Design a protein around this ligand. Structure first.
Ligand SMILES: NC(=O)c1ccc[n+]([C@@H]2O[C@H](COP(=O)([O-])OP(=O)(O)OC[C@H]3O[C@@H](n4cnc5c(N)ncnc54)[C@H](OP(=O)(O)O)[C@@H]3O)[C@@H](O)[C@H]2O)c1
Ligand SMILES: O=C(O)c1cc(-c2ccccc2)cc(Cl)c1O
Ligand SMILES: [Zn+2]
Length: 318
């Protein structure tokens, strides 16, 4: 099942997440990505940050060479990291992802986070006291370089991630904009359902792509270990039993029925094969409303290490 983007291109509504916590060997990304394609995932997500571009690329190209899928059947996303916001650094960053993937183009390229950091190899550059070295870049300038990647054919569609309403409006209202973002990829699940943001994106022809839809990796110290665990939620568990399925499949189906494109990461073969079954059942309107009731302002990935700078996206209401 696919959604038509404001760019004419299509995006599978179920996506395979590929981030894993630093402690997971990079070899794991390889087999898990192969498993996902085999189970039926067609839309995979990755970015320079994840240090996995090479493995995911190996996996996808294996699946294309064995004949399982054609390149046009795969929807592959990449993301421009905070250290390459500067306009003249955007194309090299994308081209570097491409060389690592061994692919000639990505289906989707996102500005990964609206706060910039010092250019260089280090993804989170720090001074000699451990203090983060932030950068000052006009996101409108970043966006115009992202646009030229689309003009060059290196990215089929382009979009954003972790932008708030203010920041979406700054891109939309930029003098001479060529292409609106096709999507805003943000944290979304039953505990933090982003109704306001989802409505706003919808009003502007932007898809909301929900990350950490299963309650997140819970990796420390990015996510407070004292936060409630989404998948232990009693109502998701009751809904799972009633439909002969699990709580993860309930959270995934919820997003598909409210107009959201949803990601799901797993490196476990059983969970991978299970997650594609979201298309096999549905929730009634009263069940959707029960899930809506779960919303409790629990943002798992606060990324508050990046608070301070003017573009920190999460101090605003949405
Ligand atoms: N743009 C951004 O800034 C941003 C931020 C966060 C995430 N993302 C993207 O979104 C993807 C997913 O988010 P996330 O990585 O936080 O993970 P998630 O999709 O919310 O899943 C979290 C955990 O749920 C487990 N899980 C998966 N299927 C399950 C099932 N059927 N039953 C029980 N547990 C299940 C996985 O562990 P197992 O592997 O052990 O199955 C995984 O660790 C990421 O990998 C990344 O691609 C983007
Ligand atoms: O999956 C992602 O895209 C992701 C991004 C950041 C990150 C770190 C710093 C600033 C913004 C995003 C941190 C974690 Cl733990 C993630 O899983
Ligand atoms: Zn039902």
């Amino acid at each position: 099942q696919c959604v038509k983007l404001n760019d004419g291109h299509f995006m599978p509504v179920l996506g395979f997440g590929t981030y894993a916590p630093a402690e997971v060997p990079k070899s794991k990304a390889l087999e898990a990505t192969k498993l996902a394609i085999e189970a039926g995932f067609r839309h995979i997500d990755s970015a320079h940050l994840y240090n996995n571009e090479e493995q995911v690329g190996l996996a996808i190209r294996s699946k294309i060479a064995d004949g399982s899928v054609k390149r046009e059947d795969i929807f592959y996303t990449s993301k421009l990291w905070c250290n390459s916001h500067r306009p003249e650094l955007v194309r090299p960053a994308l081209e570097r992802s491409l060389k690592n993937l061994q692919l000639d183009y990505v289906d989707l390229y996102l500005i990964h986070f609206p706060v910039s950091v010092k250019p260089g190899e280090e993804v989170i550059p720090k001074d000699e006291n451990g203090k983060i070295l932030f950068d000052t870049v006009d996101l409108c300038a970043t966006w115009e370089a992202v646009e030229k990647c689309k003009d060059a054919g290196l990215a089929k569609s382009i979009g954003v991630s972790n932008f708030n309403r203010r920041q979406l409006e700054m891109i939309l209202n930029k003098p001479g904009l060529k292409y609106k973002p096709v999507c805003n990829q943000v944290e979304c699940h039953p505990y933090f359902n982003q109704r306001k943001l989802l409505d706003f994106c919808k009003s502007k022809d932007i898809v909301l792509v929900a990350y950490s839809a299963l309650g997140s990796h819970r990796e420390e110290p990015w996510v407070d270990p004292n936060s409630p665990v989404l998948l232990e939620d009693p109502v998701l568990c009751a809904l799972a039993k009633k439909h002969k399925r699990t709580p993860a499949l309930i959270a995934l189906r919820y997003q598909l029925q409210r107009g959201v494109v949803v990601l799901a990461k797993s490196y476990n073969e059983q969970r991978i094969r299970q997650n594609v079954q979201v298309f096999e059942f549905q929730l009634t309107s009263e069940e959707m409303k029960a899930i809506d009731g779960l919303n409790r302002n629990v943002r798992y990935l606060t990324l508050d290490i990046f608070a301070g700078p003017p573009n920190y996206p999460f101090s605003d209401e949405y």
